[PDB]
Amino acid sequence: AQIIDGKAIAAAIRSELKDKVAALRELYGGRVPGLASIIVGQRMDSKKYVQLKHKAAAEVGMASFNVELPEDISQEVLEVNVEKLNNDPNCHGIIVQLPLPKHLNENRAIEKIHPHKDADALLPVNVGLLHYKGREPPFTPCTAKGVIVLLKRCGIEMAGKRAVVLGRSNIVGAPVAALLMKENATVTIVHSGTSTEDMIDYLRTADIVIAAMGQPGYVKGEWIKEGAAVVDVGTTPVPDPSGYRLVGDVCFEEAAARAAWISPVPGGVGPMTIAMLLENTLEAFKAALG
Amino acid sequence: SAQIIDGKAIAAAIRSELKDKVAALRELYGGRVPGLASIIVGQRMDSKKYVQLKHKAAAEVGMASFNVELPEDISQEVLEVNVEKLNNDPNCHGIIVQLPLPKHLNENRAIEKIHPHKDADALLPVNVGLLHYKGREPPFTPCTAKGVIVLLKRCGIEMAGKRAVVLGRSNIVGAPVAALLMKENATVTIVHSGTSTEDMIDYLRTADIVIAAMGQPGYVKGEWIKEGAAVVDVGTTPVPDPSRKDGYRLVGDVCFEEAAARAAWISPVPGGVGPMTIAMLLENTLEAFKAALGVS
Ligand SMILES: [Cl-]
């Protein structure tokens, strides 16, 4: 199996964005793209991703606006802070770090984000534009965009191929399936309603497999078609060593013995999703002054 | 042999149910009633006929009807103004623009003017988004798409835990119905122009449900259908075979008589969708009126 090096590929894209952003700074005053990120409650998991997200933003020479709010916050306040970032012309990309507190309604908060700034592509209007044939959205969900880029960059054919997507999530599973189809892959989406032996039968002939269920060590190598490509989007924290570890959905050592390609975890689609968020933001800024 | 999914009858039953529901809401809410509004531009006899049929169905159920007929050579701006008038008309709950418009007008732009909550055909991206958004329900589902799922539910055809193949990925039927089946927990594969014939056949071999939406007359062979499967033929294409007035008959994607020997359930063309689509347009419009009042 060929290790799909997302860390390397993303490193290449990050530099391409830095040099692109540098050029635009010369052409348009002291202006640079802005990446905002609201966080409700001091959640340990989400705090880490935010630190990594603004690091790459700083590494590519973008502005970062990290809003943090406490746990016991009313919806009105959360929606005011989003509208603040909407009216801020120095902020071009807005994301709300899920998962929010149970008492807060995520849907109605995300709805407040302007369509031209919805950098994570979570607004229904952006989800629709994606799925609608003959219409292309302002943004694509980062993880799904990344998976396709790793597919193209590695020279992996999607036209006329059989594709199984494990998971139907709004962030990864659904959008990747829609995009794989847009590349003339014949896609089947597996999920909790699917029986295990159905899953395995779909996997039996799958040329491309996307593990986006988010359950560590679920996909075994025996299911993967010999000569297929497997993208492990799963990235759940396990507390085994030292003080945490990032294990994915695919049983790597099993799947590597059969698949022609395999994305590892860590160092797979994780750095891609960050790169795509920046590229989205960069494209967001380029739209504002195109 | 396979049993015949009588879509015509099912739709008839639904129109009766809507009629009663609309009559029940009248008593409770001051004699108020749902309004289905349409906009047609120019004078195409195809578009005029379609619009009559929808408005007649709306009359049978006791809904109000709003037909706006604009000239063929009218401005985009002026069309959109009339669309905005309907948006701000509380007597009107559903709004459809009859397609295709004249070439000089922009359709997607005229449709974008419609308020998301009055988009009876579910043509707006935001409604398409909500339809695909796992964990949210759209105010409207695409009519033909929704009526295919209701055909199944009403025949007692299980979707959850089943394998399904949607032949075709068209915006108007294929794509939406594929997501509705997944939402119903069927495991769905969408076959399309990029799909190999051998794979298409392989997928169909295990398909408990099959939705024929490619638009190719008589191409799904009966032997490809899994023994006991449910087949919904949504494709419709005229052919010059039959000695008849007009010299044609509508023929579906599926070879019916072949599919009947293997399938448990099937919907023939004619009998596939048709009055279901219009029925689903009325149900969509009821939900809008039900929503606009505050009733769940
Ligand atoms: Cl699921």
Author numbering:
A (entry chain B): 4 to 245, 249 to 296
B (entry chain A): 3 to 298
Q: What does the article say, verbatim?
A:
Three enzyme activities in the protozoan Leishmania major, namely N5,N10-methylenetetrahydrofolate dehydrogenase/N5,N10-methenyltetrahydrofolate cyclohydrolase (DHCH) and N10-formyltetrahydrofolate ligase (FTL) produce the essential intermediate N10-formyltetrahydrofolate. A two-step reaction follows, initially an NADP+ or NAD+ dependant oxidization of N5,N10-methylenetetrahydrofolate to the intermediate N5,N10-methenyltetrahydrofolate catalyzed by N5,N10-methylenetetrahydrofolate dehydrogenase (DH) and the methenyl derivative subsequently hydrolyzed to N10-formyltetrahydrofolate by N5,N10-methenyltetrahydrofolate cyclohydrolase (CH). All trypanosomatids possess this dehydrogenase and cyclohydrolase activity with a cytosolic bifunctional enzyme (DHCH). The cytosolic DHCH activity appears essential in L. major since knockouts of the disomic copies were not possible without ectopic expression of FTL to provide an alternative route to N10-formyltetrahydrofolate.
The crystal structure of LmDHCH has been determined at 2.7 Å resolution. The asymmetric unit is a homodimer and subunits are labeled A and B. The first and last few residues (1–2 and 1–3, 297–298 in chains A and B, respectively) are disordered and an additional three residues are disordered in chain B (248–250). Superposition of subunit A onto subunit B gives an RMSD of 1.7 Å over 286 main chain Cα atoms. This high value reflects differences in domain positions, which will be discussed, and in a loop adjacent to the active site (residues 240–255; RMSD 4.1 Å over 13 Cα). The LmDHCH subunit consists of 298 residues displaying a high level of secondary structure; 11 α-helices and 11 β-strands. The polypeptide folds into N- and C-terminal domains comprising residues 5–147 and 148–298, respectively. A cleft is formed between the two domains and at one end an NADP+ binding site, typical of a Rossmann fold (βαβαβ), is formed. The substrate-binding site is at the other end of the cleft. Analysis of the domains of LmDHCH from the crystallographically independent chains shows a significant pivot around a hinge (residues 150–152 and 274–280) with a rotation of almost 14° evident. The subunits appear in distinct states, with the active site slightly more compressed in one than the other and this may represent a feature of DHCH activity.
